[PDB]
Amino acid sequence: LSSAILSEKPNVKWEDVAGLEGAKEALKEAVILPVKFPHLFKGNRKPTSGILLYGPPGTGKSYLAKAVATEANSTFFSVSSSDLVSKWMGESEKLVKQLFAMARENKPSIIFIDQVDALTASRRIKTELLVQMNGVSQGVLVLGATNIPWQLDSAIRRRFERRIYIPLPDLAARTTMFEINVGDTPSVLTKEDYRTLGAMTEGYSGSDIAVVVKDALMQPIRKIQSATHFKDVSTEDDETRKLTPSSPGDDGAIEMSWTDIEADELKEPDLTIKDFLKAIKSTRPTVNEDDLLKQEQFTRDFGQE
């Protein structure tokens, strides 16, 4: 049990994952199939250990990998390549030998090395990986992720036979992400509305939409933080009272600072279309058609397979 190497029994199913209807498939057949039907792989037909997940930042690849882990009962074992070179460059060769050791002795397991491009002295940490990987049988497979395919070592890449591409969320994908992110939170938003925020957020990534909603969710909390007068909006059927901030002097006004209001009696105001627009506009897309063309090029070349 280390402090830098995450370990756990991931509980994320394909359905908890944005869209990626296809990368999911590829992963199913690349990882699930071989673990489920171990026999189909007799002499010379070896499953492929070492899967590379590459795509624009904010597409949440690690989530998807945990998803693989789950979908094929296996213990997850993450580790941020960034940190392995920054906040931990000292115990580098170690934690690596540790990460693999730990995983190797918890079969079935998935070793998730995020930001693999980060590993490029450091030429001393590239080998420990090679020594491990090109030495990992059928017990533990390595999933590596990167947002920068190109700036990836020519050697390490080669030890990543299969290579799925994780794209930015399409419309259906984004619309869901909004819905997922929001959740049970009281909103006035129709299903169609979400479809719209979906369209309004073209070019956005999972991470971006995340921020968008996380800020939109802060509207009502702000709406009562700056609330002066309230209103008793409870139907003759409600048990406890429902006091929700109201405008100036509406057909129900009544000056009161949220400070003086019962727990059971507070009624959070429903999310508004405006609420998301404000939040949408407040945020700009992280990627760009430039730092997104190299992806395609990569998916085109990606020779040393």
Ligand X SMILES: Nc1ncnc2c1ncn2[C@@H]1O[C@H](COP(=O)(O)OP(=O)(O)O)[C@@H](O)[C@H]1O
Residues in contact with ligand X by the rule CB under 6 A: 17-18, 57-63, 114, 145, 147, 177, 180, 206-207, 210
Specify whether the CB–CB gap between 98 and 65 falls below 8 A.
no
- Contacts with 148 (C-beta within 8 Å, 6 or more apart), sequence order: 117
List the strands of the sheet with 162-165, edge to edge: 75-77, 109-114, 140-146, 51-54, 162-165
CB of 40 to ligand X, least distance (A): 30
Q: Which is nearer to ligand X, 116 or 227 (CB)?
A: 116
Report the C-alpha gap between 126 and 154 in whole angstroms. 11
- 62 labeled binding residue: yes
Q: Which is nearer to ligand X, 19 or 34 (CB)?
A: 19
CB of 79 to ligand X, least distance (A): 12
Report the C-alpha gap between 60 and 65 in whole angstroms. 9
Q: Which is nearer to ligand X, 139 or 167 (CB)?
A: 167
CB of 136 to ligand X, least distance (A): 21
Report the C-alpha gap between 143 and 146 in whole angstroms. 10
Q: Which is nearer to ligand X, 75 or 115 (CB)?
A: 115
- 60 labeled binding residue: yes
- 126 labeled binding residue: no
- 47 labeled binding residue: no
Specify whether the CB–CB gap between 138 and 172 falls below 8 A.
no
CB of 179 to ligand X, least distance (A): 11
Which residues line the annotated binding site for ATP?
Answer: 55-62
Which residues line the annotated binding site?
Answer: 55-62
